[PDB]
């Protein structure tokens, strides 16, 4: 990490639990800037002890503009059935006045009442036919009763949410001290709180912001792909949306059975006949009816942490070639140390803070920096202060050494510069009187 | 655990699953949401 900042550990109450380890708790709030795409963030642990501390290592990998789900609803296929059993009068006694009220989910007449197949289709009485040609030789005219199926032989389901708008947001991996890792994504354009363990991410800058209109996404649950469109969604569906069936439960996303979901009047085309109805629909499938695309400072608070808690030698071996890059130079240490620890600043580098962690081994851990010369001292690294100093010829971004080119047009610019000014002298005379 | 303190309707995120729902939210924080200024 090149960008580090140390905690306020004034807040101070530790338990002697054990005297060997040591053992503490504590919270508080910290202001950490936003390090570039690519690389990780520190956060160092402080205790008034010395030998012993931690950190705490954020990663940042990518910059993205998504939304967040405020909502929630699949959709289904959509499909029209419709029934028709055709008493007639006398025959099925029906009331000369059809009972203006309608039992929508029984049907005593076909069957008493049962689990329906369809999502609360309606019900209904109808004209009549009477005489010889029906053949029931009443005269009086007949009444029949209709159903209409919303059904869903195969679907493919789709959930969909109305962000309706846009905020940067970023994917943050995090390192607890104890050695967790655990992924999320925060919604760091907006200052929402992200629930995990004992810390909390949050807000950061929005150093860029943009525009787009009414659009949100459509997924589908086998995956064939992901769409976009103008992406309409309330509590209700409103006349001429994409989304009309509005179903809230994955598991009763197949059929229609789950009450959640809510229907559309009149939507199912039910038309009638001399003898019996049949069926049609007005629905619109999602695609192909309004289709606008189609796809090809991070901060954090604190919560009561769980903080846990001798000869050490530094012994560099190299050095690479960065100033004025945005990631440095890599720098290899070889150490080795009796315990598990972490190291910490060296003064005199004048770039950045130290943070690296090590077993008990000899290893090698490097890190990145970038300066103008080598000086490479001062370090209160692990367990005792070390003075070792390096040396080296750093690379920066300059011209060509290859070939020297530059060097016979630099000898080429300077031609003729005391004769401008000889012709200038002897015409200045000329030219001022 | 003040009855004075008033919610927002369907300001948490619920959503389910075919086992079990899980927790988002839509909520603001009061910093860099609608800010004009900064007191020095």
Same mark, same amino acid.
């Given at each position: 990490?090149?960008?580090? +900042? ?9 338990? #002697? ?42 990663? *940042? ?13 699949? $959709? ?31 049907? @005593? ?47 493919? /389901?789709?959930? +969909? ?10 994917? /943050? ?7 967790? $890792?655990?992924?999320?994504? &925060? ?5 929402? #709180? !992200?629930?995990?363990?004992?810390? +909390? ?7 860029? !912001? ?10 589908? %649950? ?14 209700? =569906?409103? +006349? =001429?949306?994409? =989304? ?11 059929? /229609?059975?789950?009450? =959640? ?12 006949? $001399? ?13 192909? !009816? ?10 954090? /608070? ?13 012994? *560099?071996?190299? $050095? ?44 090698? *851990? @490097? ?27 750093? %690379?920066?971004?300059?011209? !060509? ?15 003729? &510069? ?16």
């Amino acid at each position: 990490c090149d960008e580090m +900042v140390h905690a306020d550990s004034k807040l101070v109450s530790c338990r #002697q639990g054990s005297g060997n380890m040591k053992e503490c708790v504590t919270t508080g709030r910290a202001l950490l800037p936003a390090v570039n795409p690519g690389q990780e963030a520190c956060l160092h642990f402080t205790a008034p002890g010395s030998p012993d501390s931690k950190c705490l290592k954020i990663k *940042v990998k990518r910059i993205n503009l998504k939304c967040k789900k405020s909502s929630s609803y699949f $959709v289904p296929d959509a499909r029209s059935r419709c029934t028709s059993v055709r008493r007639c009068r006398w025959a099925g006694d029906c009331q000369s006045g059809c009972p203006p009220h309608f039992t929508s989910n029984s049907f @005593s007449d076909d069957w008493a009442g049962k689990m329906d197949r369809a999502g609360l289709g309606f019900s209904g009485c109808s004209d009549g036919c009477g005489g010889a040609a029906c053949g029931c030789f009443n005269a009086a005219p007949s009444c029949i009763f209709w159903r209409k199926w919303v059904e869903n032989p195969h679907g493919i /389901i789709w959930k +969909v949410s109305p962000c309706a708008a846009w905020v940067p947001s970023a994917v /943050i991996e995090l390192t607890m001290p104890s050695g967790e $890792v655990r992924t999320f994504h &925060p919604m760091s354009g907006i200052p929402t #709180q !992200v629930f995990k363990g004992v810390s +909390v991410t949050y807000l950061g800058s929005d150093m860029e !912001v943009s525009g787009l209109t009414d659009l949100c996404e459509i997924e589908e %649950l086998k995956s064939k792909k992901l769409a976009l469109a103008p992406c309409n969604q309330a509590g209700m =569906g409103v +006349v =001429g949306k994409v =989304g009309e069936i509005q179903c809230s439960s994955e598991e009763s996303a197949r059929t /229609i059975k789950k009450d =959640g979901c809510i229907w559309n009047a009149d939507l199912v085309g039910i038309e009638l006949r $001399v003898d019996d109805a049949v069926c049609y629909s007005k629905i619109t499938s999602v695609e192909a !009816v309004a289709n606008y695309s189609a796809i090809p400072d991070i901060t954090a /608070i604190r919560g009561s942490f769980s903080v846990n808690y001798a000869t050490c030698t530094g012994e *560099v071996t190299n $050095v690479s070639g960065c100033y004025s890059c945005m990631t440095g130079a890599k720098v290899s240490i070889k150490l080795h140390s009796s315990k598990n620890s972490t190291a910490h600043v060296r003064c005199k580098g004048d770039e950045t803070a130290f943070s690296v962690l090590e077993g008990v081994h000899s290893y090698t *851990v @490097s890190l990145s920096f970038d300066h103008a010369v080598v000086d490479e001292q001062c370090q209160l690294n692990c367990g005792g202060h070390e003075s070792q100093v390096t040396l080296k010829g750093n %690379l920066i971004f300059l011209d !060509v050494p290859k070939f020297v080119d530059g060097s016979y047009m630099q000898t080429y610019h300077s031609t003729v &510069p005391t004769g401008a000014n000889i012709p200038s002298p002897t015409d200045w005379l000329n030219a001022l009187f």
